[PDB]
Amino acid sequence: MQLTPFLILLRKTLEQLQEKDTGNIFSEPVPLSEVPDYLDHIKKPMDFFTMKQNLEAYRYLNFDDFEEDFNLIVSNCLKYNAKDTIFYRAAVRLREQGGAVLRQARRQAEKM
């Protein structure tokens, strides 16, 4: 498999995932200034902007590493927030809608 089409695919996939985050709550890192206790149990913060930077730094060279960081966006949010919050439900919805996006993209990658 060749690097350029793979990265093209990840760029598109990231945009597609970002589209699911309609509230844009996962677009940027959790503001430690607004949420001071955040790092106390979240050992690897993640967000779509950071994923973009990792992508263009050639840090995602296979689908799994890409999907791992997406999954962190979701699990960090589920971990930090109580179940009866908008945040927690947004992460569930992202997991759900994101999963379909990722499966389709992976099958595109396996044709390469």
Identify which of residues 62 and 85 has a Cβ nearer to ligand BMF in the complex: 85
Identify which of residues 8 and 35 has a Cβ nearer to ligand BMF in the complex: 35
* DSSP string computed for 23-88: T-SSSS---TTTSTTGGGT-SS---HHHHHHHHHTT---SHHHHHHHHHHHHHHHHHHS-TTSHHH
71 touching ligand BMF, by CB under 6 A: no
Site for ligand BMF in 29-68 (CB under 6 A): 30-31, 34-35
Identify which of residues 70 and 80 has a Cβ nearer to ligand BMF in the complex: 80
Instruction: Give me the least distance between CB of 21 and ligand BMF, in Å please.
Output: 9
28 touching ligand BMF, by CB under 6 A: yes
**Positive/negative CA dihedral, 20, 31, 63, 87:** negative
Interatomic CA distance for residues 90 and 77, integer angstroms: 9
Instruction: Identify the three-state secondary structure at position 6.
Output: helix
Among 55, 70, 80, 105, binds ligand BMF (CB under 6 A): 80
Q: Can you give the binding site for ligand BMF, defined by CB under 6 A?
A: 25-26, 28, 30-31, 34-35, 77, 80-81, 87
